[PDB]
Amino acid sequence: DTKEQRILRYVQQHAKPGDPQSVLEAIDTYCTQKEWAMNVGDAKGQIMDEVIQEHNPSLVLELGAYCGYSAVRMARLLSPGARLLTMEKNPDYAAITQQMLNFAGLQDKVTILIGASQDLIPQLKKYDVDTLDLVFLDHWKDRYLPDTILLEECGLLRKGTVLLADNVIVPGTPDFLAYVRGSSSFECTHYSSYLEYMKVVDGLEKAVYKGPS
């Protein structure tokens, strides 16, 4: 079994069905115990919650998924009529994410789009998306800049659209942080989670779009 299959199995065996908090705790406990991801609730979940709750988005796009932790984290916060679209190229990751949301009872809050972002971002209009309220960029940081460019080109960002990117601790290429910070179109905040010691464990960037030209 893959790691993502083993995470789902642990949830199925230990978490309370229909209880998103229980599912999140189970994923976090298991991954921390295996040393695959340390204390994600503390390192990024609390920041995700802060940003989403300050903005109350009606339409969230998640770019990237692995085991569904982030999707459950966000979907549990959405109001009636609000929804999450989760886009992921790897069908195995998308399948685990679907089953994780099902177990949490959050499946009606989410649509899972299985495909490459280059192919699917230009088709988000077919999902009745005019503009997005919040975009969560998950794990695969080298995709963040080209995905942001595609969102701009497809007219999916409005004045006030929030981008929140995970796993931006060290410089990479393409350099998403340099792009949003350097551009006058984005207002930016960086978050560094240290847990209880002095080394960064996770880093996130919030970039708020100022609107199209």
Q: Applying CB under 5 A, which residues contact Na ion?
A: 181, 183, 186
List 4, 62, 147, 166, catalytic entry: 166
Sign of the dihedral through C-alpha 192, 57, 78, 141 = negative
List 1, 35, 108, 196, catalytic entry: 196
Q: Within a 10 A sphere around the Cβ of 110, how many other Cβ atoms?
A: 24
Cβ 118 to Na ion, closest distance in Å?
A: 25
List 4, 88, 138, 147, catalytic entry: 138
For Na ion, the closer of residues 40 and 180 by Cβ is 180
Clarify whether 167 is annotated catalytic.
yes
Clarify whether 19 is annotated catalytic.
no
Burial of 87 (0-12, 13-18, 19+ CB in 10 A): buried
For Na ion, the closer of residues 125 and 190 by Cβ is 190
Clarify whether 39 is annotated catalytic.
no
For Na ion, the closer of residues 103 and 186 by Cβ is 186
Q: How far apart are CA 56 and CA 181, in angstroms?
A: 24
For Na ion, the closer of residues 6 and 181 by Cβ is 181
Clarify whether 138 is annotated catalytic.
yes
Coil, strand or helix at 102: helix
For Na ion, the nearest residue by Cβ is 186
Alpha helices in 44-116 (DSSP H): 46-55, 69-75, 91-104
Q: How far apart are CA 178 and CA 181, in angstroms?
A: 5
Clarify whether 196 is annotated catalytic.
yes
List 44, 89, 109, 141, catalytic entry: 141
Residues with catalytic function: 138, 141, 166-167, 196
